[PDB]
């Protein structure tokens, strides 16, 4: 479950 290139996980707002 790897994070896309140049991004990071956050909550939706």
Q: Which residues make up the interface to other proteins (CB under 8 A)?
A: 2-12
Q: Which residues contact 9 (CB under 8 A, 6 or more apart)?
A: 3
Residue 9 Cβ vs other proteins, minimum distance, rounded to whole Å: 4
Q: Which residues contact 3 (CB under 8 A, 6 or more apart)?
A: 9
Q: Rounded to whole angstroms, how far apart are CA atoms 9 and 2?
A: 10
Residue 12 Cβ vs other proteins, minimum distance, rounded to whole Å: 5
Residue 1 Cβ vs other proteins, minimum distance, rounded to whole Å: 8
């Amino acid at each position: 479950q790897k994070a896309p290139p140049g991004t990071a996980r956050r909550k939706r707002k």
